[model samples]
Target: EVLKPRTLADLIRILHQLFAGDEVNVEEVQAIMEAYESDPTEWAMYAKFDQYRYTRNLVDQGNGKFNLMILCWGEGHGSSIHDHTNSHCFLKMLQGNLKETLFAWPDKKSNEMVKKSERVLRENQCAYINDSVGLHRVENISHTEPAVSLHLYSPPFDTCHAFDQRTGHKNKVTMTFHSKFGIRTPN
Candidate 1:
């Protein structure tokens, strides 16, 4: 039998340490997330249109102020250029390898995004993005491997915007999940 890996409990415990008197310690949560891990058992199976979903409700918490979800990616599947509706986010790679490509704009509200950094994130790796100040796209690079990732978003929303690279206009988009809490249908 194989030994089980550490679980999300470690991350949950570390996050509770964030300074919460007056100012919310975003970095503290981020730091712990960057160093957290979970068992392979946590990587639940999900079949759909080849997209992300909530593997467990544990990822959904903190009222409307915060939300968590698990995302699955096919070898070449990814998201359209978009922003997180001013929600701070921490994305952690949960299975296989993932890639993130950051973008830049001429100004705070520049219509166009200039592609910036590209990274291939391996399992257990993570990165933080403050929604109020960032934009990017994520991808799975392997030709045969699938990838899974955990995302922590502050003040999650039901709607956000997808960007148009050529026109630089942001189109409002509604966000949906395969499951509201976890794997649906128990299939």
Candidate 2:
């Protein structure tokens, strides 16, 4: 059998129905992956900006595990300096180009931010992220094309720390929303 999500709402409803219990195990992850693989074309709803589905592929890994989906449109749009709150992650670039900048925290009290590493991914490239020593930001460098990536986290991601590059203040909180649906405004 094949399952195709016709709209963002349909996708969210599918996710909500699949994980109704809020507890996802390895089997559930496999199931989600299978569903995606079964019909990759269903993701077409994210092709447009107004209906761009940012995190539709999100899955609960149970016990602090989570996955993130991001589709960057062209240049000047990307993630800020952030940390995963001591979590492990893996990212796979699905399309376009992505520039990843890695940073190092030399000392606990150091206020100055420095770029310790960098890399660029074109397509089908994968990268690993971990809190033990991985901290950085990703950006889309192309001015004409968009980039999309998939991120998988173990034990699910809840709260994260976003850093202020200028002030070096590590005092930002991140939240997770039901992203299966596209962005919407209150009517």
Candidate 3:
């Protein structure tokens, strides 16, 4: 059973305990994610959405090993197809249903991605994906309503890679946040 977090710090503490080991217990992480669904104010207790891009709003960072972000999506807004770049990712849908379409590298030599599998996450649903597993793109799957999600990453990205199927090119881009707590500086 999930131990619901009433505050951001509580969630952070939970993560710290769950992820203290060298490897992650994916099941425990997924259950920890569901803790946010226990109360809406639990996340609001952390931060607010301010001019969030389709990417994500960085919520917190800890000990330089992990980070947290909340993604805000308007109708039809989503992410580009990309890999987590060596980080382990856990995504929880806080609001609205969304679809994450997974892709696989058909050829390792060149940058080419092919559709592999897809999962639609309803509210309170959580899932995990890693760099080795594959790459993916998330869509709001909403025509009128908005969607929101939270992502936790261990040894969080300083940079990420995006692949181009047409050009067979991969680009390494530095990661930045939409906002930090009350700090308005670029991440």
Candidate 4:
């Protein structure tokens, strides 16, 4: 068994080490993710929520190499089906539940997205996806409760393409953080 992080700080430290090399060991990272459970007090400051949409709160910048974030999803909040911009995205469920709906890459000319699969991630669960794995839409799937998920994106991206669920029209959008280092942004 590999070393497991004891706290949020420890997780960040371990992440820095894991991403220090060119090849990131997905298995090792996944193990660490599954090994630790979220402590409310440890991530409370960064769990900023929004009524309109989910919030992305940065935990660590990873020195421009990657991004460590705590994403807060309010009741009835969800993300549009989108790709990860060629980056590896590892998500760990921290609070509540999240439903991930997978879709196949859009057709070349028609731009139609084919439905693939769906699953709900529970607390302490971990999942990984990249562009090659197809697109996905993540949602809180709750009408009254909020949810939180930890995200680690390697070789961090600034923009990504979000596909329309009906028409599969692709739109490029720049990513912004709701909070940085436990401080809310003035957006």
Which candidate tops lDDT?
4
Q: What is the C-alpha lDDT of each candidate?
A: 0.64, 0.56, 0.75, 0.90
Compared with the true structure, model 4 gives a TM-score of 0.96
lDDT of 3 by residue, 44-163 (tens): 543444444464677777667688887777778877778897888998887887899988854646645678899899778888999788888888898687787888888888688777
Model 3 misplaced stretches (Cα beyond 4 Å): 6-8, 45-52, 108-112, 165-168
In lDDT terms, how accurate is model 4?
0.90
Displacement of residue 112 (Cα, Å) in model 1 is 6.1
Worst 10 residues of 1 by lDDT: 47-56
Query: Which residue window of length 10 is worst by lDDT in model 2?
Result: 47-56
| Whole-model alpha-carbon lDDT for candidate 2 | 0.56
**Candidate 2 residue-wise lDDT, 1-187, digit = tens:** 4465454345445555554465645344333433342123544444333223233234333323344454534445677778877655656565676788987753566477888789896465556667776678887777666666656565466677777776567866755543443443232
Off by over 4 Å in 1: 1-6, 13-22, 45-58, 106-112, 185-187
User: What lDDT is obtained when candidate 1 is compared to the true structure?
Assistant: 0.64
Question: What TM-score does structure 3 among the candidates reach?
Answer: 0.84
TM-score each candidate.
0.78, 0.64, 0.84, 0.96
Candidate 2 at 44: error in angstroms? Answer: 2.3
Clashing pairs in 4: none
Give candidate 2's TM-score: 0.64
RMSD for all candidates, in order, please. 5.1, 6.8, 2.7, 1.1
